[PDB]
Short mmCIF file of C-alpha atoms in Angstrom, two decimals:
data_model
loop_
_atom_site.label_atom_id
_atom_site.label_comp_id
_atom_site.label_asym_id
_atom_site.label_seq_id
_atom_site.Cartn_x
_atom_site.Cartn_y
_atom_site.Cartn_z
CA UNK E 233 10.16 2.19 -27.92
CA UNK E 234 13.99 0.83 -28.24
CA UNK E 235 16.11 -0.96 -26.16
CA UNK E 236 16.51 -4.63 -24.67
CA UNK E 237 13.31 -6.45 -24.58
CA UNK E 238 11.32 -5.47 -21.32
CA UNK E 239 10.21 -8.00 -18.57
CA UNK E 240 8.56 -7.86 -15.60
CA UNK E 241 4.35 -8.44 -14.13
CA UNK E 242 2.12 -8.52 -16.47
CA UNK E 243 -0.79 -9.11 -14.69
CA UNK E 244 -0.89 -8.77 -10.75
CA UNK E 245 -4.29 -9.81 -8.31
CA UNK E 246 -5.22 -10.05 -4.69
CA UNK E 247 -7.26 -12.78 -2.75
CA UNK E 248 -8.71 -12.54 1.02
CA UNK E 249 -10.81 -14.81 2.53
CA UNK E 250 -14.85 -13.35 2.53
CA UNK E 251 -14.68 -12.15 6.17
CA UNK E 252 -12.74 -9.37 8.13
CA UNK E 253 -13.35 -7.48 11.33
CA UNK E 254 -13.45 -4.26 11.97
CA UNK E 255 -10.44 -3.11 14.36
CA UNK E 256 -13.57 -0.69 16.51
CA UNK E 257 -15.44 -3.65 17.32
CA UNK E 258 -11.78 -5.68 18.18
CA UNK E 259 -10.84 -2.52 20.50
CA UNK E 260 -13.99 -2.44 22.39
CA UNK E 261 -13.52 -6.13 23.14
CA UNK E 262 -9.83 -6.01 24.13
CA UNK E 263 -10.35 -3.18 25.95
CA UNK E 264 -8.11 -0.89 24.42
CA UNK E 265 -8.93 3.22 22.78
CA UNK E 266 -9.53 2.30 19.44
CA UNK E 267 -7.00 4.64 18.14
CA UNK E 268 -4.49 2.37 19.14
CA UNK E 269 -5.24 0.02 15.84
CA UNK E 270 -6.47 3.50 13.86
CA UNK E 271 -3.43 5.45 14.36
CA UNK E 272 -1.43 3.95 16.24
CA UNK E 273 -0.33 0.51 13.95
CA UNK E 274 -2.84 2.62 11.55
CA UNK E 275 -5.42 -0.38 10.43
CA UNK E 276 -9.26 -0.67 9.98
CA UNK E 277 -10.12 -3.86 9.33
CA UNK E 278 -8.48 -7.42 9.78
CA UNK E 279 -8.59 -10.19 7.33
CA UNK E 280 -9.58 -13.44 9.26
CA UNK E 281 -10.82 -17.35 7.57
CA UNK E 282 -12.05 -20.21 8.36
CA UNK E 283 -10.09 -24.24 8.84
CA UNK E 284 -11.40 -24.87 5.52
CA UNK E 285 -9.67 -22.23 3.89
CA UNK E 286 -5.43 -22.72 3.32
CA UNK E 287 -2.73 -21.09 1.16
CA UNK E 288 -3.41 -22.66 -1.77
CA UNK E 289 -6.85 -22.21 -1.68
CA UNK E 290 -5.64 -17.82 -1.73
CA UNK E 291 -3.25 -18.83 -4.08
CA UNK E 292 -5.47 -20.57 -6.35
CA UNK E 293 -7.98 -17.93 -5.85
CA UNK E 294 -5.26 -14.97 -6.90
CA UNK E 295 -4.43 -17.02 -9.67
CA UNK E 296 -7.34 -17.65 -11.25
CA UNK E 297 -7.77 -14.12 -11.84
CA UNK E 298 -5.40 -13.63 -13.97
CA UNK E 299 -4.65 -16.62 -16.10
CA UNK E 300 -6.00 -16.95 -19.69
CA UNK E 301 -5.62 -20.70 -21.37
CA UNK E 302 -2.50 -19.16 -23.25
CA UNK E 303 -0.60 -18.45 -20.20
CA UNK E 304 -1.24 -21.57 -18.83
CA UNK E 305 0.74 -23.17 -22.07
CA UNK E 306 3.46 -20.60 -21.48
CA UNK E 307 4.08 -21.04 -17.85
CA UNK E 308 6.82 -23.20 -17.60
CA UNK E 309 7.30 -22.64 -13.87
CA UNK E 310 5.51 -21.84 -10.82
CA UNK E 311 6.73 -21.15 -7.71
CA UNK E 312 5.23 -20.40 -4.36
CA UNK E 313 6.51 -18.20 -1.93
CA UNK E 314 5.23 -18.71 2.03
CA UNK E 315 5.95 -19.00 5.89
CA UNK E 316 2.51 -20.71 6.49
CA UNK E 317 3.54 -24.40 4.89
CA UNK E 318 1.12 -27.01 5.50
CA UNK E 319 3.81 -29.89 4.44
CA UNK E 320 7.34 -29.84 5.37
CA UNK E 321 8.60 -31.45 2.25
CA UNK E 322 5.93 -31.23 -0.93
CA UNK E 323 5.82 -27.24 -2.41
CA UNK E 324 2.40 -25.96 -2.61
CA UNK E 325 3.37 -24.88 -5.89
CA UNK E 326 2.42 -28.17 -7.31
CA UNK E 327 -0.99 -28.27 -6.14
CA UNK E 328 -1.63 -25.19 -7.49
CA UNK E 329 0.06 -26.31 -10.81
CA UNK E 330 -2.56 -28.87 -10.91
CA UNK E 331 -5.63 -26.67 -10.09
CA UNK E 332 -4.50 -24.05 -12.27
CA UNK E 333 -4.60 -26.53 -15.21
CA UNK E 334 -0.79 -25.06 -16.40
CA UNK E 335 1.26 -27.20 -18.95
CA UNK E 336 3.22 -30.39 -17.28
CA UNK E 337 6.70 -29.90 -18.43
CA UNK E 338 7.20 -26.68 -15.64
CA UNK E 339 9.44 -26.72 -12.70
CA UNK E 340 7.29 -26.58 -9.25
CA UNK E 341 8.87 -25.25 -5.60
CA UNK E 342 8.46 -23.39 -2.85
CA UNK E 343 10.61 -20.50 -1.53
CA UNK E 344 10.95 -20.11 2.08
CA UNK E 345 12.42 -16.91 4.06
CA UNK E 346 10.12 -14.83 6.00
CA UNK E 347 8.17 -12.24 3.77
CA UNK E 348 10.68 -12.23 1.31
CA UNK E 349 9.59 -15.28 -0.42
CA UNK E 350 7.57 -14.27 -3.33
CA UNK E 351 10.08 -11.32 -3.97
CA UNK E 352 12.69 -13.73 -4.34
CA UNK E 353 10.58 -15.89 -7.13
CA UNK E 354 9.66 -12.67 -8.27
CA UNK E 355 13.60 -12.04 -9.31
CA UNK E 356 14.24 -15.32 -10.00
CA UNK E 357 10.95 -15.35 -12.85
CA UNK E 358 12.20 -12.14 -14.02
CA UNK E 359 16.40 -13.80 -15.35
CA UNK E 360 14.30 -17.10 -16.69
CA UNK E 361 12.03 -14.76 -18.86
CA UNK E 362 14.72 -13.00 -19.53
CA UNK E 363 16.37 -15.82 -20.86
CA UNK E 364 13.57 -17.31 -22.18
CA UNK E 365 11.35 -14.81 -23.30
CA UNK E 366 8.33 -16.75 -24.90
CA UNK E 367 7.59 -18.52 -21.61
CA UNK E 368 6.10 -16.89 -18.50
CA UNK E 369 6.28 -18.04 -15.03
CA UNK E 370 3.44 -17.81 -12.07
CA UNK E 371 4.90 -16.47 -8.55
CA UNK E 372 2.62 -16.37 -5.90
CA UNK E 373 2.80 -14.54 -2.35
CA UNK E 374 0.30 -16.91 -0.02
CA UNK E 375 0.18 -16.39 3.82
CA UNK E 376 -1.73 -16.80 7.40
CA UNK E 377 -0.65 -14.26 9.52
CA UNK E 378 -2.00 -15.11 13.42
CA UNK E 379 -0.75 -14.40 16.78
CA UNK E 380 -3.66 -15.18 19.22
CA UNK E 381 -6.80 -14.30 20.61
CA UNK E 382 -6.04 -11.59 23.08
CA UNK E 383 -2.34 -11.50 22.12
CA UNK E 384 0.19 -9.02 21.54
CA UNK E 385 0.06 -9.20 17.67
CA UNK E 386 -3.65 -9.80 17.01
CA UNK E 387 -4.12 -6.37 15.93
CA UNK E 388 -1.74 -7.12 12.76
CA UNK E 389 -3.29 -10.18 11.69
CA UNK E 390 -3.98 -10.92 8.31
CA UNK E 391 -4.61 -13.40 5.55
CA UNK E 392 -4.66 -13.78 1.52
CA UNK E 393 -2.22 -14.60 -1.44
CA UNK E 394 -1.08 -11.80 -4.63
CA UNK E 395 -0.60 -13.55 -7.57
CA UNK E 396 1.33 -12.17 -10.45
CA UNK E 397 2.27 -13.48 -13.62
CA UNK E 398 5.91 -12.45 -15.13
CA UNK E 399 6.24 -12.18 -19.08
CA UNK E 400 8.89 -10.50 -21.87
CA UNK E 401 6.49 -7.35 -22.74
CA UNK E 402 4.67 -7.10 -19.58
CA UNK E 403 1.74 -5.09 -19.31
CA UNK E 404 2.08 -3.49 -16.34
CA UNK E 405 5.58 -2.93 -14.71
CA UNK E 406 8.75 -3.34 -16.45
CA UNK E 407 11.53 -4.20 -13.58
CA UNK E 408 14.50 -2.99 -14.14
CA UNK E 409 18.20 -4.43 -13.48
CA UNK E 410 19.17 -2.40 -9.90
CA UNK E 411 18.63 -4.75 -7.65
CA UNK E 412 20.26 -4.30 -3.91
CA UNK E 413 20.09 -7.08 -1.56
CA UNK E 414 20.90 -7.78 2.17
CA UNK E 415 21.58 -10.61 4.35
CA UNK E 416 22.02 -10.05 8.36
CA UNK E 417 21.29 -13.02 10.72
CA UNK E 418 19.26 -11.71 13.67
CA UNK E 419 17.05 -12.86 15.42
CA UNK E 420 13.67 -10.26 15.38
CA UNK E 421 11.07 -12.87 13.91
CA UNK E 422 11.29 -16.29 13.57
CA UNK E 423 9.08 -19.73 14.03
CA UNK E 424 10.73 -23.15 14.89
CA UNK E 425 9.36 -26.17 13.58
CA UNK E 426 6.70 -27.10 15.94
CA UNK E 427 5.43 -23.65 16.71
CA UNK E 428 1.97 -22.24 15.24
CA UNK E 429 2.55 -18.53 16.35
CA UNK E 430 6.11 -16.95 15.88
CA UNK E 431 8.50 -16.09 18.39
CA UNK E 432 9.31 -12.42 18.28
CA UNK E 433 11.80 -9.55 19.66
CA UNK E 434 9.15 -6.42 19.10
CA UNK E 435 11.76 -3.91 19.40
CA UNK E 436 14.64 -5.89 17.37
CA UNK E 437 11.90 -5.83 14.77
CA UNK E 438 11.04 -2.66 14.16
CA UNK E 439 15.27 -1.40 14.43
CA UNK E 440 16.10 -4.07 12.14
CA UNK E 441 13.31 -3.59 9.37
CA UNK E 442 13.78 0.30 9.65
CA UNK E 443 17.62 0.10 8.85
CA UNK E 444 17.82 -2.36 6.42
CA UNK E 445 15.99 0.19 4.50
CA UNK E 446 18.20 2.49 5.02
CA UNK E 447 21.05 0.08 3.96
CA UNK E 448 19.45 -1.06 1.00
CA UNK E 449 18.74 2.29 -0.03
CA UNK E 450 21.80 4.35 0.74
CA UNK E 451 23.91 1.30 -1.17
CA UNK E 452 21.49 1.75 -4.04
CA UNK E 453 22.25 5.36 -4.33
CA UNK E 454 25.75 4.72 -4.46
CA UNK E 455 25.34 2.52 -7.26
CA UNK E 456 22.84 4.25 -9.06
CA UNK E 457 23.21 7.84 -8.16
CA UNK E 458 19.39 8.08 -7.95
CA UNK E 459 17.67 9.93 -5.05
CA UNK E 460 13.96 10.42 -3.82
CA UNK E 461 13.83 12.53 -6.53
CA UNK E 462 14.22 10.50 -8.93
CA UNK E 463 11.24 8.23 -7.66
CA UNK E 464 7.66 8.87 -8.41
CA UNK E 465 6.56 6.46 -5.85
CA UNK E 466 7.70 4.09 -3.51
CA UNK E 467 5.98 0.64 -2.34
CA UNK E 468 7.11 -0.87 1.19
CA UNK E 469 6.80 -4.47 2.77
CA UNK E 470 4.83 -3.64 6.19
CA UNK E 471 3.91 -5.15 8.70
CA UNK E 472 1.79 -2.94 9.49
CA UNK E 473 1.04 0.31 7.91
CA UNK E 474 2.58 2.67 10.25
CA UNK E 475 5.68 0.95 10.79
CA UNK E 476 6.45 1.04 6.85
CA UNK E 477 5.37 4.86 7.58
CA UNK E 478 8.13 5.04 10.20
CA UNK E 479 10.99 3.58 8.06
CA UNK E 480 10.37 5.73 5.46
CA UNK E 481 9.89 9.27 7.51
CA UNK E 482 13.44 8.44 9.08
CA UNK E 483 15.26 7.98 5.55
CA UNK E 484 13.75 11.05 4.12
CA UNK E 485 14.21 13.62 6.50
CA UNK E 486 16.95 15.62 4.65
CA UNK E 487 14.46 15.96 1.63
CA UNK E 488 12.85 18.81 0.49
CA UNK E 489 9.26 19.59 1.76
CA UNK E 490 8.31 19.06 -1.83
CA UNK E 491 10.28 15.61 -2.17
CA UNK E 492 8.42 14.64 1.41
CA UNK E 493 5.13 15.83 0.94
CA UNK E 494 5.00 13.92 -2.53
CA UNK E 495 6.51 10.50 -1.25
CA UNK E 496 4.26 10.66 2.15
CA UNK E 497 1.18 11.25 -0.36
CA UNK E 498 2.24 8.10 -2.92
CA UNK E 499 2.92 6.03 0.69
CA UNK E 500 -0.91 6.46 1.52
CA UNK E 501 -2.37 5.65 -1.31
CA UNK E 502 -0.39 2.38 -1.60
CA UNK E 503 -1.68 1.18 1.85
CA UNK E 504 -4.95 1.89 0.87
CA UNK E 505 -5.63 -1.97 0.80
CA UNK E 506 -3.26 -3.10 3.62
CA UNK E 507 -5.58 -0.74 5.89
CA UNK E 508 -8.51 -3.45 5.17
CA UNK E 509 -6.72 -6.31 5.36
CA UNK E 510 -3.80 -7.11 7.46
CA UNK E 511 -0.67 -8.73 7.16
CA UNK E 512 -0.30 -10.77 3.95
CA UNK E 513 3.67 -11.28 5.26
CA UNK E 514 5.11 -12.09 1.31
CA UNK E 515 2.10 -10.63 0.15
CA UNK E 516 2.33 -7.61 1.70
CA UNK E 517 4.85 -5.36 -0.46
CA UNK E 518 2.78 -6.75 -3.24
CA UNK E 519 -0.26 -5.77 -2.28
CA UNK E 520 0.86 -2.01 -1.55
CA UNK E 521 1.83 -2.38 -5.20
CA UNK E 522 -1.84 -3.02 -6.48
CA UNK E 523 -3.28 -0.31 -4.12
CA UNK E 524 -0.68 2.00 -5.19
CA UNK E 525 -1.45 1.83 -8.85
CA UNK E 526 -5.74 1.13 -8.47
CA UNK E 527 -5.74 4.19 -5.94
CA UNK E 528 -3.41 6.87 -7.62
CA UNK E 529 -4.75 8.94 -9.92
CA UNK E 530 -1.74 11.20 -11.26
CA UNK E 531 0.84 8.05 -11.80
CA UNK E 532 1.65 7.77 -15.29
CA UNK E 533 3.89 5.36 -17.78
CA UNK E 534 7.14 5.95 -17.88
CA UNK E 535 7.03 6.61 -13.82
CA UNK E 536 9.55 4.90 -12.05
CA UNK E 537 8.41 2.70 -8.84
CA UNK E 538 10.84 1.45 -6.14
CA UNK E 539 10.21 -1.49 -4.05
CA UNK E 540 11.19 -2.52 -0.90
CA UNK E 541 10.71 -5.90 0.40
CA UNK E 542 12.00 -7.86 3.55
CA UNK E 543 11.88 -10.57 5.34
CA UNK E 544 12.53 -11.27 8.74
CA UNK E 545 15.51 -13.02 9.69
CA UNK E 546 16.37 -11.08 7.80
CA UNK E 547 16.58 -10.43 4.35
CA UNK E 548 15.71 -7.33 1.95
CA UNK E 549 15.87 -6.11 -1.26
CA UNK E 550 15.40 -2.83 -3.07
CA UNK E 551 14.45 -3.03 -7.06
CA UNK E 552 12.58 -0.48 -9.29
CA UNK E 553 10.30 -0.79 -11.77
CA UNK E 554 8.64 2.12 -14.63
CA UNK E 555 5.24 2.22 -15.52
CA UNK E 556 3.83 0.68 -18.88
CA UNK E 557 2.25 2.60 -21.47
CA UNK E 558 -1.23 1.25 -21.31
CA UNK E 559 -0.55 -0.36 -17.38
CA UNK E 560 -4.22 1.24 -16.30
CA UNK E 561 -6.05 -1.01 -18.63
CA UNK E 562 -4.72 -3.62 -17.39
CA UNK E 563 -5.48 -3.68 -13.40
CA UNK E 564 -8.43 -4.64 -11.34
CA UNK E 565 -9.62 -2.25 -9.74
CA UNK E 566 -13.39 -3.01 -9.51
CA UNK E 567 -12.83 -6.19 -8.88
CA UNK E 568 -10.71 -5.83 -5.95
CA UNK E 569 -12.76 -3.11 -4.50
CA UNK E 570 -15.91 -5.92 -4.88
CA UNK E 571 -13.74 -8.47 -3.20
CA UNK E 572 -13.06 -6.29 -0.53
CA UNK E 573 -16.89 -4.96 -0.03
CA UNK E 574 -18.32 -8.32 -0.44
CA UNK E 575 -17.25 -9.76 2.65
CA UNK E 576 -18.84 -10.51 5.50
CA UNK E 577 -18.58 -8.71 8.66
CA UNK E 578 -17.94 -10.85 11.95
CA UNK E 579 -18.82 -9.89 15.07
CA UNK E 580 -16.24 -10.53 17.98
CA UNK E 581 -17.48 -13.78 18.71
CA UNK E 582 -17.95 -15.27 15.53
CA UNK E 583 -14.73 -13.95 15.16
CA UNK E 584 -13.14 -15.70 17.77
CA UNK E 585 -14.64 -18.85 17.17
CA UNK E 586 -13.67 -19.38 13.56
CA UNK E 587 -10.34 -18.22 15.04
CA UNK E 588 -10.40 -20.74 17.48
CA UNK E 589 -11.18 -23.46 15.27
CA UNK E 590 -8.14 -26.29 14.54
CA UNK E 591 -7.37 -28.37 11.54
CA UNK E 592 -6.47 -31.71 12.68
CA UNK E 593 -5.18 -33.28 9.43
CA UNK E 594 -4.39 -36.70 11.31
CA UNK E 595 -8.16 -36.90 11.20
CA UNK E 596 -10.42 -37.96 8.06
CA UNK E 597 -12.71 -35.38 7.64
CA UNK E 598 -15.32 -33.17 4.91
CA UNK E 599 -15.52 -29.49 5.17
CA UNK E 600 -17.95 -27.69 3.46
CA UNK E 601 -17.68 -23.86 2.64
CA UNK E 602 -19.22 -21.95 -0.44
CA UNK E 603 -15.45 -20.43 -1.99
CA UNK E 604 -14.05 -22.06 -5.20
CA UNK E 605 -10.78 -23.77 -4.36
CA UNK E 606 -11.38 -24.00 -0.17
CA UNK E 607 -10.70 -27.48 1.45
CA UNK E 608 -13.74 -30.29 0.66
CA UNK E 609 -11.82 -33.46 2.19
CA UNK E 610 -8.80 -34.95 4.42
CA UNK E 611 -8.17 -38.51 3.87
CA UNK E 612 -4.98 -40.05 4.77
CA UNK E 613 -3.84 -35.94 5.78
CA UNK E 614 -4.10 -35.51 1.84
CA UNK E 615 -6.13 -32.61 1.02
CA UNK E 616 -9.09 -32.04 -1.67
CA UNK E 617 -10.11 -28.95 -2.99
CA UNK E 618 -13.19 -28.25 -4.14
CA UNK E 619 -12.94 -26.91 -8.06
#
């Protein structure tokens, strides 16, 4: 009720392709207790599509969720934040400008740095509304996370875009101006150009994610002064659900049972989602955002949220945001809940034949597949989406 003008999301969505399997049924054919995907990595079912289905087709599905004709004339950027490129030089950002019929004078890119990228547009939206409070600007997480039929990381697949839209007044999550963020160059997770899975050190991974929290956090607290306590939640980039588990557990150790107890309990309700999808890489932190505030039932306005998002490479960031009066009006809920029950259950083989399935984009080609905004054409490696 006084103060600087807020900013931050507005509106926030999810998209995942129509068709998952269950990690049981992926188990039983890789041979493996079942409890290793359950417990161990701690995921249920695995988002998986089809050649005809791309980034922008999740990103134009994410979007169109949330976008009225107003905020269309207001956006005055969009940017797209991704590791799974399909050019090297044109941003997907501008074919989604086109689809999602936004005004022409706006600024169109794509950021590129592991997981990170959306969280970087997400700050970057945030100082231009700032600046510019009557316009709004569209960031969107998009990703294809695969490793391989019968590979190490199969288990952690994933696929899907989070849109959100970033506005002076914002309905939802007002971010505030705390930001701490981290640059290291090592080596845990990277792709060269000319590779379709990425190369990875497992164990440099999982050291490197789990103390850049710790470095991000304990710098914030010098800054800031604030502690757990002063958190009512806390959402976590993961790439998979027990390894955001693990980062966290080792950072608040020296808390109070209550302190513990309360965080662990806000933790599971935020990877509510992730547990039925997979990795959305950008979209991941982002995601445990929405199923944080659609599966809690005791978070309030005026609660503060802390985010943590990395990427590997690496790069991370820790920001907070507070609660909305109003915010629970304003999410989707049912609709994600429908998207998520609506899809259709592969077995192993159909499974591992839409997985198997290439997109040659040298070739002219139609594709034909029932989803708004999936791939109808290649002609001259220039794709069409159906709309």
């Amino acid at each position: 009720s006084t103060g600087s003008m807020t900013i931050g999301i507005d509106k926030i969505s999810f998209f995942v392709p129509p068709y998952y399997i269950d990690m049981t049924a992926l188990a039983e054919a890789r041979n493996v207790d079942p409890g290793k995907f359950h417990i161990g990595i701690g995921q249920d079912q695995m988002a998986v599509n089809p050649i005809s289905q791309d980034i922008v087709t999740f990103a134009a599905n994410a979007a169109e969720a949330i976008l009225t004709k107003e905020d269309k004339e207001a956006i005055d950027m969009v940017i797209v934040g991704t590791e799974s490129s399909i050019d090297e030089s044109k941003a997907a950002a501008v074919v989604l400008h086109r689809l999602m019929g936004i005004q022409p004078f706006a600024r169109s890119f794509e950021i590129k740095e592991a997981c990170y990228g959306a969280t970087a547009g997400l700050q970057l939206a945030k100082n231009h509304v700032a600046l510019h409070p009557d316009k709004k600007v569209l960031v969107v997480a998009a990703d294809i996370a695969k490793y391989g039929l019968n590979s190490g990381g199969e288990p952690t697949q994933g696929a899907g875009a989070v849109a959100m839209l970033v506005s002076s007044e914002p309905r939802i999550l007002a971010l505030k101006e705390d930001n701490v963020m981290l640059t290291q160059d090592i080596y845990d997770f990277w792709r060269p150009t000319g590779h379709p899975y990425p190369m990875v050190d497992g164990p440099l991974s999982n050291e490197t994610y789990i103390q850049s929290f710790a470095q991000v956090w304990d710098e914030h607290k010098k800054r800031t002064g604030l502690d757990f306590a002063d958190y009512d939640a806390l959402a976590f980039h993961i790439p998979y659900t027990k390894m955001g588990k693990k980062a966290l557990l080792a950072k608040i150790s020296d808390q109070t049972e209550a302190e513990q107890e309360r965080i662990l309990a806000r933790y599971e309700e935020s990877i509510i989602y992730s547990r039925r999808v997979g990795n959305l890489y950008t979209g991941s932190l982002y995601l445990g955002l929405i199923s944080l505030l659609e599966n809690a039932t005791t978070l309030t306005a005026g609660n503060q949220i802390g985010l943590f998002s990395y990427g590997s490479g690496a790069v991370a960031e820790f920001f907070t945001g507070e609660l909305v009066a109003g915010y629970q009006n304003h999410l989707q809920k049912e609709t994600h809940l429908a998207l998520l029950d609506n899809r259709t259950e592969l077995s192993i083989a159909e499974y591992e034949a839409m997985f198997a399935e290439t997109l040659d984009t040298d070739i002219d080609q139609t594709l034909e597949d029932e989803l708004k905004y999936s791939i109808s054409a290649i002609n001259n490696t220039v794709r069409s989406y159906r709309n």
